[PDB]
Design a protein around this ligand. Structure first.
Ligand code: NAG
Lengths: 50, 50
């Protein structure tokens, strides 16, 4: 049975992962934000929640 | 409150979706032999403030 309620959903299970490439101009969707650029390694360290 | 500065980082995120108007804080009391009495008077609290 499917319930529709006035609340955000909790179960969707998208999955469908993909490998990684570096130093190549590729399209990326890391968590939901799109872009078109190249990837590399950065020295700055994020805070744990960033 | 000391005269200082400090930032608050996020802890949790609850997708609840209810209506909130009021709240109440709880407390933990202690009952020992040094505070005789029944369940309504025989307890000790401790030093605290908020
Ligand atoms: C409770 O919150 C809902 C939001 O979905 C709102 O529509 C409603 O007016 C609020 N108050 C109630 C149900 O008394």
């Amino acid at each position: 049975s499917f319930e529709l309620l006035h609340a955000p959903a909790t179960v969707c299970g998208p999955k469908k992962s993909t490998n990684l490439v570096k130093n190549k101009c590729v399209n990326f969707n890391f968590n939901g934000l799109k872009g078109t650029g190249v990837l590399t390694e950065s020295n700055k360290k994020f805070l744990p929640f960033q | 409150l000391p005269q200082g500065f400090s930032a608050l980082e996020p802890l949790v995120d609850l997708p609840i979706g209810i209506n909130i108007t009021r709240f109440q804080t709880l407390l933990a009391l202690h009952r020992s032999y040094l505070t005789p009495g029944d369940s309504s008077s025989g307890w000790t609290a401790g030093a605290a403030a908020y």
